[PDB]
Amino acid sequence: YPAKPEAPGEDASPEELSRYYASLRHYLNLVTRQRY
């Protein structure tokens, strides 16, 4: 389970705070070990 999480976002748009770069977390905190 790699990254590439389209991520949600919405505070501003699909980025809210910079391509939801902040939400990027998902990646190794969504694919990391808990698995999808």
**Taking the mean position of all CA atoms in its chain, how far away is CA 6?**
6
Experimental method: NMR
Distance of alpha carbon 17 from alpha carbon 8, whole angstroms? 12
- Tell me if 28 sits within 8 A of 3, measured CB to CB: yes
- Cβ-based neighbours of 31, under 8 Å, separated by 6 or more: 1, 2, 3, 5
Supply the DSSP symbol for 13: S
The two tokens of residue 23 are 């939400």
Please count the structural domains in the chain. Answer: 1
Distance of alpha carbon 20 from alpha carbon 10, whole angstroms? 9
Half-sphere exposure of 17 (CA within 13 A, CB side): 4
**Which structural domain, as residue segments, surrounds residue 9?**
1-36
Distance of alpha carbon 3 from alpha carbon 22, whole angstroms? 14
Q: For tokens 């969504």, what's the residue?
A: 30
